């Protein structure tokens, strides 16, 4: 999505964008960035751990 304007269908297209909205959006993106950061790190750790475990209690690992 470049700065090519789309065809407006409501005035809700121009609605919202205030400084309060900016602050809320920045707080939310910070929070979700942190949460997804932790989640993805845990996912990679679990992936590597399960790959290294192999058949120690597992079956069908082929």
């Amino acid at each position: 999505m470049e700065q090519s304007q789309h065809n407006v269908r409501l005035n809700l297209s121009t609605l919202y964008g205030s400084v309060t909205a900016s602050s809320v959006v920045c707080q939310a993106i910070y929070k979700i960035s942190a949460t997804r950061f932790l989640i993805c790190r845990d996912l990679l750790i679990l992936q590597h751990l399960l790959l290294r475990l192999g058949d120690m209690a597992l079956v069908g690992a082929g």
């Binding site: 290294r52 475990l53 192999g54 058949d55 120690m56 209690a57 079956v59 082929g62």
Partner: protein, 301 residues
Amino acid sequence: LSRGIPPSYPPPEQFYYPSTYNFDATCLLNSGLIHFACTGFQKETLHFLKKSGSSLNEAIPDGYNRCLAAGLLAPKFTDVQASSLSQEEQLQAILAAAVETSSLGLLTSCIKRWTAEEQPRSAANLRFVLEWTWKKVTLTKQEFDRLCFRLFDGSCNFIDPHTLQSLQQCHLYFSNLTAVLNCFIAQAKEVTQQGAVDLTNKQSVTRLLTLYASVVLWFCRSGMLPDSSDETVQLTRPFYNYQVIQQYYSDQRKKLERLARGKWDTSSLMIDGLINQFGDRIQQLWSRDDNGTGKYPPANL
């Protein structure tokens, strides 16, 4: 209500005893709830010993006795009591078991604990465990060679899950002993320079075996043995056409020679220069293959 996980299926006889059943429960009253745990004695003893790991040796008798009584030890460790053993051999057996459990962390944490506070027999214990580690490396590499030779020759085309499990156990052992030696050099404040040199030599040996086990396991799991060009073992993965590729690069080499004549230095392949930096050691290594002696692609996997 649940049971523990084994380092290798099937579960031992300890799984079939109620002592393995660790379960928490809640009793309702007329004043509240009271919550308790059942058969946590084994982990209580284990964690007490580990927190006493800075002086673990003196508590090994009683702690090992408690673990045996709770059934935490493997079924084979129940036949020998801490009263008839000494703390050192008890610890060596525990360290061995941690190796087959693929638990290098227990050894690393225990040795780091021993590095602090006065404990004279810690040096003796680490010495004994290091020669034990090296001899275990030797036996594991010998056993791995015995498993892999029948596949290299081609006698066994498909191994069983048990052979695959044993190979995975050997690889995990290699990883754990790597970690043990690297920890050892990490908290080693003082060794002879010759000792450091040979310890680094043996750790490099462990790296070679670990990567070799990984790659050979990968070929076995992918079915690339005996060899990948074997059309009989290729039913799930791209097969290999040795003749086409080898003849193509032989023709490439001849074409390069004929173009170079005596006005160019370029008369060898890029892989040829690559092996040249390593010298003719690789030539002697590969001088047992058909379609050229030490010529890429070498015929032997």
